[PDB]
Amino acid sequence: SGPQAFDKNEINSLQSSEGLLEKIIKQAKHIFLRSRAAATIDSLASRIEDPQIQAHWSNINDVYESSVKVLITSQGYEQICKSIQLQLNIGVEQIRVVHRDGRVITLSYQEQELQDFLLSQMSQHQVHAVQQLAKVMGWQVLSFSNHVGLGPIESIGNASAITVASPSGDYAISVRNGPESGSKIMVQFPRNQCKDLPKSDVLQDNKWSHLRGPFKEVQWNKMEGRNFVYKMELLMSALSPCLL
Amino acid sequence: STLVDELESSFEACFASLVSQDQEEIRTGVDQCIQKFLDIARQTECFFLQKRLQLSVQKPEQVIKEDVSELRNELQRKDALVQKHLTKLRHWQQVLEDI
Amino acid sequence: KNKLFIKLTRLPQYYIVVEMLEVPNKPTQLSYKYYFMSVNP
Amino acid sequence: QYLCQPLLDAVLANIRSPVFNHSLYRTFVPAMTAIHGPPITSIPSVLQGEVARLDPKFLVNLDPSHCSNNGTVHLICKLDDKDLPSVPPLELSVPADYPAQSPLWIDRQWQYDANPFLQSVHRCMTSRLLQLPDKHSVTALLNTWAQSVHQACLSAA
Amino acid sequence: NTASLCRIGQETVQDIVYRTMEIFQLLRNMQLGTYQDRLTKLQDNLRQLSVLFRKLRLVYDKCNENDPIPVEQLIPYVESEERREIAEVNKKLKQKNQQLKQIMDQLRNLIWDINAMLAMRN
Amino acid sequence: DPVQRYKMLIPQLKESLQTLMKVAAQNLIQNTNIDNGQKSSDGPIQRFDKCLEEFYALCDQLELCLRLAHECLSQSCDSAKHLPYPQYLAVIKAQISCAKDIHTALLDCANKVTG
Amino acid sequence: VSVNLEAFSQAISAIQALRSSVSRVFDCLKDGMRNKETLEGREKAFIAHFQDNLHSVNRDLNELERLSNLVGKLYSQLLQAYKWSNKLQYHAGLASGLLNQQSLKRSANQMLVLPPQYVDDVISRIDRMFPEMSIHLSRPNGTSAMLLVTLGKVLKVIVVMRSLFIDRTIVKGYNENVYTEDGKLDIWSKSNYQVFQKVTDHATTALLHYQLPQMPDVVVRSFMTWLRSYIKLFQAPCQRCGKFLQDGLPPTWRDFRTLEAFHDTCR
Amino acid sequence: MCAFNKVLAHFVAMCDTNMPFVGLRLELSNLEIPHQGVQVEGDGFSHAIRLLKIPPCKGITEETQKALDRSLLDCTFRLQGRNNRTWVAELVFANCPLNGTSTREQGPSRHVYLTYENLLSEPVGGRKVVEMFLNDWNSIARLYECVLEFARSLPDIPAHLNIFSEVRVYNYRKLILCYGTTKGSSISIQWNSIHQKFHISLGTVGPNSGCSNCHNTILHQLQEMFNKTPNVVQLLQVLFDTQAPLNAINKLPTCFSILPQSSTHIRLAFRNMYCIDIYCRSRGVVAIRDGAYSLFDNSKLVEGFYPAPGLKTFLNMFVSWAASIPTILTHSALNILLLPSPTPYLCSPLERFLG
C-alpha cells in the first residue's frame, strides 16, 4: 500500500473483518432466493403451456451468486422465435435481469415480481413470434409496436401489437397480445368481400372495391392447432390464393 | 403448372450462370434467381398448409393419431434418457465408493 | 416539490412529470398528477 | 466553360435566325452520319378516397337535397357504435378543390337544443373545431365529432 | 396419415432450401486431398438433394390425390376411443414429467451444493 | 509502359478537344455567315470531320491501353492468388482438372434433377 | 494491389463517358432547336441542354486527368479455370448470403461433448489474429475453460466458457486486480466503476445475441470481433448526440453488425 | 399487489408511440402534401397517416399525371420496427398497365411497400423521410411514363419482338424484361434519382445462355441510348439486332480487344496493329470494314492502326484502299467467320487471316 499507492477503498477492502454470521446469513439468503426463483420458473413451465419456457442453470456458482438462461420459444418453431432470451443473476437480495436486446432490470427478492416479469415476456414473445413468422411466409409487416399505447389498460405490463399484410395485397392480420387480456386477433378483408358492408352512394367507381375497408374478428378458440404460432400459420395459409 | 416442377426449374435456373461454356451481372442474376426460388418454395409450403387445414377440419382423427404417435415417442425418449443417466449414476457410485 | 421527471430517450425534448400529492382524508394513499412538458440553460 | 467556350459563343451569337437549324444540320450531320452510321433503327375522387377508407362507425351518404354533380358536394353522415349514443346526423359541405382548403360543418343549433346532452355534444364539438389545424380533411371533422360525443358521454357520467 | 404427409411435404421444402444454402457454402469455400474430400461432399449433397426432389414429387402426388370445402370458410369468426387413448397417454406422461422434475431438482441441488462446498475451501 | 502511355495520351486528348471545339465553332460561324446574308472569307477552314475522328482515335487508344493494363493487373492478382517447372505444370494440370471436376459435378447433378 | 484495379476500371469508365458525352453534344446540336410552345421557353431549353452537355464533357475530362494524377503501375485453359473459379466464388458468396438471411427452417426436429484440446486449438486460433488482444486460457475448475482476454490498456475480460460455448463474461478495467488472494481468477466480482458494469451488461447481451445453434467457432470469433471494437473507448463519440458524455458515461454500446459507438440511452 | 402504477406505464407508452407521428405531420405540412390527420387505423391498436394527393411531379406529361392520380388509391404511412423509427408507406395502385410472368396476374391492385429509416440524429419524422418519399414517388412516375408508352404499343408490336421477350416483373419501381428465344437473359430498367438517370442492368436468369449476358460489352452505350430516348421498343430492337453479333464476338479470345464505340458500332482490334469495324444493322445484317483507314481522307490512316492487306477478299469468301467500304453479312457468315473451327488449336478464321 505504501509504494504502490492505494486509495481509501483498497485499504478498507484489505482490512474488513466481516463476521461469520453475516456470511452465513448471506449464504442462506442466496440459497432461499435461488430456490424461490427456480420454483417460480418451474411453476410457469408447469402451468402455462402456451409459448413455452426453458431454463439452463449454470455449472458454476458462488456462495452469493448463480445464473440461469431463460428462453421463451413457441413449441414447434424454435428456429424462428429466438428473440426473447434472458439472463438472471441471482444475488443475495436482488435478481438482476439482462435481456437479449440490452435492457437491464433489477427485481427484488419477492416472487411476485419475477412472475409478473416473465408473464410480460411471454406476452411480448407471442408477438415477436408472429413478426418472425411473417418474415418466413413472405407477408409484409406493416406495423409493429412493442408496447402499444391505445386501448384498455393492462395490469401487469404493456401490450404489443403488429399488423401484417398478405403478399398479394388483400388480406391483413392484426394481433394485439397483452399479459392480462391476451390475443385480440382480427383479420381485415377487402371490400366487395364482406357483403354485409352498407354501401354508400359517394363511391361511384368500382376501383374502390379493392381497398381493404372492413374488419372482422377471428374467434381464437375453435381455430385448429395445438399452439399459437401453429394457428397463426394456418390462418396465414388460409388467406392465400388457393393454389391446390 | 404443378409447383414441384416450377420449383425444379427455378432451382436449375439458380445454377445457369455457372454451368455453361462481371460483378453486377452476377449480382442481378443471383438476386432474381434466388427470389423466384424462395417465392416458389413459400408457395409450396402454403399449398401443404392449406391441404393440412382442410384435412384437420374434415378428417380430425388423423390429427389425433399423429398426436398419439408423438406422445408415445416422447415417452420412449424420456425412458432412454433416464436409463442412460441411471447407468452413469451407478458407475459414479462405484467410483465414489472407492475413496 | 415531490415530482418525478421522466425523459423520453427515443425523442428528447419531451418529459412526463409526475406530481405526487397527499389525498386529505386517507393518510396512506397518494394522488398522482401527470403533466407533459417540452424543453429546449 | 473552359475548352468549350467558342462553340458556346458561336451558338449564342446565332440564335433567332430562322435558318439556324439548317446551319447546324449542314455543319454537323455529315460527320455524325459518316461516323455513327445512319440514325435510329362527377364527385371528385379525393372524396371517394376518403369515404372508401372510413371506419365502419360512420355511414356517410350524399344529401337527397342540395345541388348535385356540381362544384361543391354535400354529405349527411351518421354514427353507429354500441359505445356511443344515437346523435343528430351532421351535415357537411365539401367545396370543390377540396384539398388545400377546409370543408364546412353546416350548423343546426335547433336540434342540438332540447337536451342537456346534445348541448354538451355541441359545445365540445365547437371547441374541438376551434382547436383544429387549417386545411383539415373530412375525417378530421368526423373524428372530432366522435370524440366530442365520447367526451359528452364521459363529462355527463 | 395424410395429415402427416402434409407435414413431411412441408419439411422437404424446408430441407431443400437449407441444403441449397449448404451447397452454396461448399462452393464458396472450395479453393481450386481435401480437394477430393470437398468433391465427395459436393456430389453426396447433390445426390441427397435429388432424392429430396423425388420424395417431394411423391408426397405432392399422394396429398393431391386425397376439396369440397373452400378455404376462408374454415376460420371461426365471432358472430371416440382415441380421445380416451389421448387421455391415457396424457396422464402417463404427466406422471413421467413430474418424476423427471424430481430427478432434475435433485441434480440441481447436488450441483449447487458441490459448487458451494468447493468454493469455500480456498 | 501503360501508365506512361496514359500520361502520353492525356495532353494529346486535351489538344484534340481544343481543336475540335474551335474548328466546330469556325465551321458553324462560316455556315451561318453563308446561310444568313453575310460576307466571309473562304480561307483555310480546316474541316471538322477529321478532328472528330481524330478525337475518336485517341479515345480508342486510351481505352485500349487501359483495358490491357487492367487485364494484366487482374491477371497478376489471380496468378498470385493461385520451383521446378514440371512441378509448376503438375499443379497447373491439377488446378485445371479440379475446376473441371467441380464444373462437371454441378452440370451433371443440375441435369440429374430434371432432364 | 486492388487500388490499381479500381483506379483502372474507374478510368475506363471515364474514357467511355468522355467519348459518349462529346458525341452527345454534337448529336443534340445536330437536331437543332425544338419547338416547346413558348418561344422564350424553347430558347431556354436549347441553351440549358447545350450548357449541361458541355459541362458534362468538362467534368469527364477533369475526372480522366484526376485518375491520371492518381494512377500507379493450353495456357488459356488455366486462365479460363481461374476466371470460372472467381466467378463461382463470388456467385456462391452472394447466393449464400441471400439464402441464409431468409431460411425457412422452423424447428430442428422432423417427422456439447468436446475434447478440451479442441477448445484450446480454437481459442489459440482466435488469439493468433487480433494482435492487441491476448487470450490466456486456464482451467481451475474442471473442463470449463476460463479465459482472460486483455485488450490494449483498456479492458480485462474474464470469459467463463462451458464446453466451447461462452457462458458468462465480466469486464473489468486495466489496473483492477482480477486475481484473488491465491492468484486464481476472480470469477465473481464487479468492477467498482459505472462504465465497466455497463460493459458487462452489454457483453451479456452480446453473448445472448451471437447465437448460432450448432457451430460455436463463428460464435467465439464474432464475439471477439465485437469485443475488439471496444479499444476505442474513451475516444469515440456517440453517433447520435455527438458528445462523449451522457450522465458521465462514455458511449458504452458498440452496436452488433456495425460496430458503432452509442450511449445506451441513445439506444 | 398494486405496486405497478399501470396509468404511468400507459402514458409513457402512449407518448412514445404517438409522438413520432407529430413530427411527420409537421414535415408533411411544410411540403403541403394534403393528408387526413393522425388517425387510429381500423383496429384500435395502431396509427396511420394517409395522404390525399402527393404533389404532382417535376418533368413528366400531364397525361401521365392524370393516369397516375386516377390509379392511386391509398398511400398510408405506418411506424414499425424496433426503436419505432422505421416508416413504411404502402402505396396501392389500381389499373396496372402490364402484368408479369411472375404470378402477379391477380386482381388489379398492386401494393408497393416503401420503407424509410432516418438516422439516429435528425429525428424520426424529418425533412429526410419526406424527401426520400418524394424521390421514390418521382422514380415511380418517371418509369410509369415509359410503361404507359410500352403498354400502349403492346397490341401493335412488330411481332418478332412479341416472340423475343416477355415481361417478368413490374413493381412500379423496376421493369424486368426477359428476352431471348429461351427467355434466358434479362434487362432491368429503373429510374435512379441520385444521378437522375435510368439504370439498365443486365443479368442471366434462365438455363440456356452463355456464362454472361453477352450485352454486357455494350451496356454503357445501351444505358446512354436509353437515357437519350426512353422507349422500350427501341431497346428491344437494339437488343434484337445486336444479340447475334455480340454473342459471336464475345467468344473471341483475349490479342483480340473489343472497343465498343457507339452502340451497334463494335470495333475489334487484333493485338495493336489491326482494326476492324462492325456495324450491326437491321434484318440480320452486319457490315464490316477495315478500321485503320479513314472515313474521310482515304490516303491517311488512323493514329494507332495499320491497314490489313487483303482483308476485302477474305470477307468476300464468306459473302487498293477498297477495304474502307463496308461488306455486309448474314450473322451466320459472322458465326462462321468468328467461331473457332479447326483449320482447313481451334482458332478462328478471322484470327488466322490477321495472323
Ligand SMILES: [Zn+2]
Ligand atoms: Zn449519445
